[PDB]
Amino acid sequence: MAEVEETLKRLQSQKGVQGIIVVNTEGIPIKSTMDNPTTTQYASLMHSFILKARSTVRDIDPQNDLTFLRIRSKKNEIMVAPDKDYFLIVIQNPTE
Amino acid sequence: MAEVEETLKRLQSQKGVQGIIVVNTEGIPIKSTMDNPTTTQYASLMHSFILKARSTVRDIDPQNDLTFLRIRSKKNEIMVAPDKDYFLIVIQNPTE
Numbered sequence: 001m002a003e004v005e006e007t008l009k010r011l012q013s014q015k016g017v018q019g020i021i022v023v024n025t026e027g028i029p030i031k032s033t034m035d036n037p038t039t040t041q042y043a044s045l046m047h048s049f050i051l052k053a054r055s056t057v058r059d060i061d062p063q064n065d066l067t068f069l070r071i072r073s074k075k076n077e078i079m080v081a082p083d084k085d086y087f088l089i090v091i092q093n094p095t096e
Numbered sequence: 097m098a099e100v101e102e103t104l105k106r107l108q109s110q111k112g113v114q115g116i117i118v119v120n121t122e123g124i125p126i127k128s129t130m131d132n133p134t135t136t137q138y139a140s141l142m143h144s145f146i147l148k149a150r151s152t153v154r155d156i157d158p159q160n161d162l163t164f165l166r167i168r169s170k171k172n173e174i175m176v177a178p179d180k181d182y183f184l185i186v187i188q189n190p191t192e
Contacts (some may be wrong), residue, residue: 041155041156042156045152045155045156048152049149049152052148053145053148053149053167056141056145056148057169059137059140059141060137060138060141060174061169061171063170064169064170064171065169065170066167067168067169067170068168068192069167069168070165070166070167071149071153071162071164072162072163072164072177073153073156073160073161073162074159074160074161074163075157081168096164
């Protein structure tokens, strides 16, 4: 938990970050700064993102693994990837 | 089409590139450098990939549109995004 808190501090301290969400293996948002309705949705939505893309990646090759999933949108970029036992979600302005 | 072809030559000319594929909205790989079975599979799950995320993003909000899909793997990084009427896919070694 502290790990995410250490990164959230610098993120929320810098300009560009819109909010950081953290979901556990159970699916519950252990921590989040986004909106109420925006967090609850992102929790499952994001969690399902890596879950869906994962089953697909397996088709890309026999021996593969997921460790990064970005999606540059029109509003902002939300970084999401599989962690030890949780799903990190970093939302902020676009970089591309 | 030519645009993608111009970028393919340079890519195939440089190291790192594993293989580039060019699929349309219908599902026909106008261009491909990978293997026979490797192309069909890639172009197969390709359309299924965008259709998967595009279906999820709809939950994030009403007004939006994906324009970048990157997935860092263990074998290589596969980046794909929506084009004029096709889906460009650049496969090569990892960058980050």
